[PDB]
Structures are given as C-alpha cells and as structure tokens.
Subunit: 199 residues, 4 copies
C-alpha cells in the first residue's frame, strides 16, 4: 500500500522559541521517518502471512504493526496540531464543547496537562471525541498506541510526551514543555477535526 | 483460504473417566468451532483493511485476531496432545531432555502443574522448546495468547486451564483436573513435536 | 485487621430458576472464600515486606493482592446487587440518570450486555459512576481487577462473566446467562450505591 | 522506612567521553532523586491504606509503587554497574558461564545489545540469573518494572535505554549509546552479583 513520510507544513524552526529547530528536525526526519519505514516492512510481511494463513506469524507481527503504525498515525496528526499561526484559545462550537464538558477552557488546559505530565514512561496525551456518548474526552496512550485504534475515540489534539519530544530543550522538566506547547497549538486544525465528527 | 475445525482423533467419550464426554463435546463442537468461524471472519476484515492501508482498522482488529486465532491454534494442538492410549511416561530423547532440564519426570510434572494452577483467570500452561537456547521451557499464557506467536517457544504440550475445560466435572478444584489429565497425555505426539525441533 | 466473607442476604436457592443453587453455593462458599483467605495471607506478607522496606517483595506481591483483593471486592458487591425480589426497572433519580446518559433503560441494558459478553476470557461488566464528569459509565474489567481501584469509577452494578458464574447452568451460551440475570437485579441496592455518590 | 538517594561512587564526569557529565548529573540528581522521593510518599500512603484494610487504595497505589520503586531499584543497580575502571571482558567463572550459556562473550554482547535496542519505548535490558534453572538469561523490562520483582531473575547487569539516558549525547542513535557503554561496564561488580547467586 506504501505509507509515506508527510512533508511538514512549515519550517523546522517555525515553532521557536517554544520548540527549537533541532527537536523538530530530529523528530520529523529521524523518528517519524523510522516509523514509516518499519511500518511498510511490517505491512508487507503481514500480507505474506495472511496469504499463507499463517496465524502464528500474524500474531508475532502485532507489536511491530501497532508500534510503528501508531507512530506513523500519531506523528502525522501531531504535525497538523501545531502551527506558527497557533496559540490562544479556540472559538465557535469547539470552545462551547470545551465549556460544557470541562467547565472552562482553563480547566480543560489543567486536565490535559495533568494527563500528559502523568504518563509513566513514553506515551501521548489526547483530547478525543466519544462518538457513542457525544462529548469530549481526555485520554492517555502508552508508547505509540494510537487513540482511535485502541480506544475508539476520535483524535482531536495530541501531545507527544516521549522524552525525544522535549529533552534537548527542557531536559527532565516535562511541565515546562507542556506549558510552552500551548503557544503553538493549531486550534484551526483541532476545530476541523471536531466538526468532521459532527453530522 | 480457510482455516477448518479439525476432527477429533477419538470418540468424545474416549477420555473417560479422566475427562467426561460432555466436556469434550462442548469444548470441541462449541468452543473451538466458534474460534475458527470468528477467525475466518476476522481474517477477511483484515484483508480489506490491509488492502486499503487502513492502519487504524488493522490495529483495532488485533485483539480479535489474537483471541480467535490463538484459540484455534491452542485447541488444535490440545486435541493431538491427548489420547485414550496415553498416560505413563515418555521414552527416547524426550525423557532424557526432561530429566536434563528438570531433574526428573516427576519434578517436570510438578513444575508444569504449578504453572497451570497458578494462572489467574483463563489461560494455558505449556511445555515449550527454546530453539535459541536448545532446551525445554515451561511457560504460561493468558486467555488464548498462543505460545509461539507471543513468546517464540515451540509448543510441545499444552494444558487448557480455562474454566470451561474442567468445571463441569471438577468444579473449582483445578488441581483435581490437573492430576487426571496426566493419564491421557499423548506422549507419542509430544515426542513427534519435540523431534520436529531436532535436526 | 481481618477481611471477612460476608453472609449472603438470601438463601442459596433464592435466585432460581435464573441462577441455580449449586452455582450460588459454589460461587460463595468456595470461590469467594478462597479470595478472602488468600487476601488475608497476602496482606500479612505485604506488612512484613513493607516493614522491612523490601521494594522487590512489595512489587512481587502485587498480582496476588490485586487478584484476591479484587476478587473479594467484586464478589461482595455482586451479592448485594442481586435479590429474589429484584428485576424490573429502577425508579427515581437512577432511572432518569440512565435515560439521560444512555437514551433509555433498554439501550443501557444492551450496552452493559454487549460489554459483558465482549469480555475475552474472565472478567466483569460494570455500571459505574464518574465522579469527575458526574455521569454514568459502562466499563469492563479483566479477571478480578476491581473497578474503583483500577479506573476510578464508583461501582454501581457488576456482572460476573467468569465462566464459573454460569457454566454449570448455561454452558457456553453467555448471552443466555446475561438475559436471565436482569430478572434478579437488586435495583434498590444499585439506587443506594448511586445516591451515595450524590450529595 | 525511608529510602535515600545513594551517593555516586565516582565523579559525574568520570565516564567521559562514553557518557558525558551532563547526562550523569541529570540522571542521578534529577531522575533518580524523583523516583526516591515519590517512592517514599507512595510507601507512606500504602502503610495507611494497609492499616485501614482499604483494598481499593492499596490497588490504586500499585502503579506508582512499581514505577517509582522500580526506578529506585534499577538506577541504584545501574550506578554500581558502571565505573571509570570498567570496560574489557570479565574473568573467572562469570566468563565461563557466559561461554556456556551464550556460546561466546561476543555472542552475549550481540544478544544483550539486540534486547536493549529492541525495547519499544522506555525500558531496560538485563543480564539476569535464573536460580531455578541455574543459568544466565537475558530479559527486557518495560518502563521501570524491576527485573527480580517481575520475573524472578537476579539482576547482574542492567542497561538503561530510556531516552533520558543517552539522548543529549547520542540523539536518536540508540546503537551508538549501546556500543559506547561496554567501555565503562564494571565487570567486578557484575561478578560479585553473580557469585552472590552461587552457593
Ligand atoms: Mn515523537
Ligand atoms: Mn479451551
Ligand atoms: Mn466470580
Ligand atoms: Mn534512567
């Protein structure tokens, strides 16, 4: 099927000083590229195993498929969630949905930050949409487990809290990284994902 | 491209009184049949997701593939591991490998029984072969997770400790079920699986 | 400092024909009794490890504590969730909360049944209360993992889908067990647990 | 009981150029210190919960206890596994045990490197001793899960492959970090741990 490393919609240094250029260059051109390359290799092996009816080979390939496939999914959403145009607060029905489900935008900020900072090891903090219940929901995913594939929630905004996402600039202080990322959140993209959920 | 429910190599009541006919009939004609049918349904869904490059659908289908695919793998080995002619002790290279790696046949029995009984919830106890290290190994698998697909060990002898495998006859006393199953272990089949590792 | 096996609030045969007396007698007098006894044994071992500062022993004891501690918690709620007088529909604020969060009582029944039946292996289906969001929530727990300890939800109604809870009467047909248990649900007790959240 | 951050047996820059001083200072004075502080807080909460017979609170505290307790255990072993005196090959019975169980020292190096590099997300690569089987064994542990508490193996040599252990110096190239760490392995300490296993 071939999965490809998507181009960035902005310069590597466009998010400075909140996220420096060296992190962006390494995160995109090294980490994400590795996920896409290993995903294509894994998908080809699974097609061969599925054709043979080799159930053992299919099951043995599941960790690599979820890890590299999730890494591709999560990082491709992550780039669209950020923008040099970003920051501030959302508007329209997204802001009102945040008000109804979390109380206020400031309360939503506190809960997503707490879930992000609270991740033990590598993982992701997500703002998702619960199509069954019809409200917003915050969830944390370990390693590269993708939100929709594992929980059914529709991903709206993701925060990478892998150490490679901040350590070069913020060292061990994960909260400092979380506080700075709010300044480059592309709320236009987050609203477009939310409206796609709505009828 | 079908996986099929294998026929039993013996009558449903051939293992009495150690395992009664109603358990054997239900385990084969109901439980195993459900695993194979759901495995075929799941495999077709995965082929559609794989053809479209839908990574989210591939990851969402992994629990059903592992559960039903493992259930088919585990139970098809299980039927060949039993025989009305079985019981006693193995001979040839199998017995010497057991003594070399476990000390004695009786201690091997105790170690596999302890791992079986120790399963919290549903699972399987396995005697496996480590091709890398070239010795025997005992492992426990949760639910329907298959041995080779999840651990790399080659399955030689498996003990189903799902409650459906003994509850109708032995109720909550799992050790009573474990003591009786040694009387119908098909050491001929276990020897052939062990020799398949050797070359 | 003992945890004790609670007495049943009804006769072992009081739930017939929906759940027969032999299942109730075995589930309470054998399964639950084993959980409480092993919980007390495990709690004493942890006190010794905790007093010595043995972190390795504390971590090694975690599976036994969660399994037997959860087994005690889950089953003691389970007995109070059932009654020979039960069945029908709840009234008061409970019914309005169910309609508000699920649409209707019948759809809530379908959603809890689907989560129950969908458990791969041993586990529990739960109706819980999310104190943070202030609405009802359905969750599934594996093995004996308790609802509040692992998810933070307050347990209101639990459905045991371990095979020992139905196999003697309904064999492999889990949906048949689910359909009959609605006839003895103690909505009075579920209402009291729900009101305990309210204040 | 109080757990304390152990002093380093060497200068922060004593492992240069293989591991630079800034990584060592951050790894010890920030990461490990956080594990010890959170472990003491968690241990105090568990003592209160155990005294009350609060099983739910005990189970809710298990992730924090394993994560911070394991972080303390793993890092306290890690510092003793490294030395400016280190590098080269082991001698005596340790080297012969490596020869018998892995074929050669070079083959052991390849297998431990592969397990380290193969960790998906945060984790550890371990050389352990299997007291039951009486041979050496390589295992990988996720996040801060300690070796002995989770697997029963006695830890001899540990390799931290959390991104905070190498990213400042080696960026995304985990193999470059693994190749350099062999030059500072304290084989004297590893042999002392191995002989403590022997009668
Ligand atoms: Mn990343
Ligand atoms: Mn079975
Ligand atoms: Mn039960
Ligand atoms: Mn570390």
């Amino acid at each position: 099927m071939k999965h490809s490393l998507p181009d960035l919609p902005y310069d590597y240094g466009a998010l400075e000083p909140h996220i420096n250029a060296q992190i962006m260059q390494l995160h995109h051109s090294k980490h994400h590229a590795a996920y896409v390359n290993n995903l294509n290799v894994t998908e080809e092996k699974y097609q061969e195993a599925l054709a043979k009816g080799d159930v053992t080979a299919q099951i043995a390939l599941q960790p690599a498929l979820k890890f590299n496939g999730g890494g591709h999914i999560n990082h491709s959403i992550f780039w669209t969630n950020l923008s040099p145009n970003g920051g501030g607060e959302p508007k329209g029905e997204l802001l009102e949905a945040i008000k109804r489900d979390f109380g206020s935008f400031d309360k939503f900020k506190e809960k997503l930050t707490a879930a992000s900072v609270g991740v033990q090891g590598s993982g992701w903090g997500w703002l998702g949409f619960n199509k069954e219940r019809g409200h917003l929901q915050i969830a944390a995913c370990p390693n590269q487990d993708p939100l929709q594939g594992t929980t059914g929630l529709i991903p709206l905004l993701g925060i990478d809290v892998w150490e490679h996402a901040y350590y070069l600039q913020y060292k061990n202080v994960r909260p400092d990284y979380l506080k700075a990322i709010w300044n480059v959140i592309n709320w236009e993209n987050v609203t477009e994902r939310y409206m796609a959920c709505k009828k």
